[PDB]
Design a protein around this motif. Sequence first.
Motif, mmCIF file in Angstrom:
data_model
loop_
_atom_site.group_PDB
_atom_site.id
_atom_site.type_symbol
_atom_site.label_atom_id
_atom_site.label_comp_id
_atom_site.label_asym_id
_atom_site.label_seq_id
_atom_site.Cartn_x
_atom_site.Cartn_y
_atom_site.Cartn_z
ATOM 1 N N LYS A 10 0.831 -1.199 0.000
ATOM 2 C CA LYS A 10 0.000 0.000 0.000
ATOM 3 C C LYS A 10 0.866 1.251 0.000
ATOM 4 N N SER A 14 0.953 4.156 -3.287
ATOM 5 C CA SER A 14 0.735 5.580 -3.052
ATOM 6 C C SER A 14 1.999 6.378 -3.345
ATOM 7 N N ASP A 351 -3.759 -1.674 8.990
ATOM 8 C CA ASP A 351 -4.727 -2.026 7.955
ATOM 9 C C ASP A 351 -5.726 -0.903 7.689
#
Length: 351
Positions: A10, A14, A351
Amino acid sequence: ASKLRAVLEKLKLSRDDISTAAGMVKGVVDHLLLRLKCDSAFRGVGLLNTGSYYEHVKISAPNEFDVMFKLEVPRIQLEEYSNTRAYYFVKFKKENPLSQFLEGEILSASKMLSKFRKIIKEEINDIKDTDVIMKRKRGGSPAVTLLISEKISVDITLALESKSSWPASTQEGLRIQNWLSAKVRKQLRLKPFYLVPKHAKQEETWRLSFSHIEKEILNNHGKSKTCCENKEEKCCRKDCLKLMKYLLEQLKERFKDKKHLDKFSSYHVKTAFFHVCTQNPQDSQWDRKDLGLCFDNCVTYFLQCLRTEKLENYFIPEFNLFSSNLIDKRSKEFLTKQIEYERNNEFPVFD
Ligand SMILES: O=C(O)c1cc(-c2ccccc2O)nc2c(Cl)cccc12
Ligand SMILES: [Zn+2]
């Protein structure tokens, strides 16, 4: 080791996908640099690296930028202040380049920043490109904090460049001889170093900066010269640092109402990471398959630093970043328990 993979991916996506933020920063910086070069005191100002405008300390903030303007000062005379190992007076040894800031033989920092801010203040108002507003929150450096649009923020730090050998307080630092070899340490210690305006706790002092050395170590980090070049056999050193940085950002964010974690920054986690790299010099000790265990060795070592209240500056061994005068035990005991909770409950803040 599974969930740490999803966190790092993640962060990867980004960090990767498209944004016009870096382009707006470069436009503002180049406008400033040409404006500052048109001035007598800052004619030799320039970026640390060309192309490096988008340096990200906060690894979860894509719209927060950190740039450094360097200034070469020939024949710097450094006078260590109050046995602080890291804070120095700057004096001069036959020109008058920056002499408009001398108070005695001692170089004034708060005055150089005032002229630095006013010149940047003149170039900001003369901008028709984008919405740019200047902030002057205290703390010597970051000297200026700009805001572009409603997301892009840039911290600009003015730094002096010295090319003499490093100050004596660094002689027994950078202990990389059994990891990156003694010959690389000699090469790195031949490179320049930088001084930014900073108070230990009033006076006109400067602090040593070796972030450029840390950046070079991160990009050439293995005991083997081919480390991470076989992209199917990459070590997890860089991923452990990211996971350590992201853990502190998430904890500082979750407790920004309380004030117990304000003294901590990614530099503390970065410093502790380098110490573990010295403890574990072999690339085999950073196998990609051991991501969970390698990340635990970092969390373990950093937790011991909080309890013992000991974190040596990686370049200045006698400077304890966890000194009780810098960070009281209440703050370090608070951070010790929060990480221990995350570690035991499988890092919920991921998360
Ligand atoms: O630019 C650097 O290398 C650098 C040095 C130091 C430092 C040096 C000596 C004593 C205490 C310190 O905190 N701190 C930093 C922080 Cl807190 C943030 C970003 C960079 C730095
Ligand atoms: Zn590697």
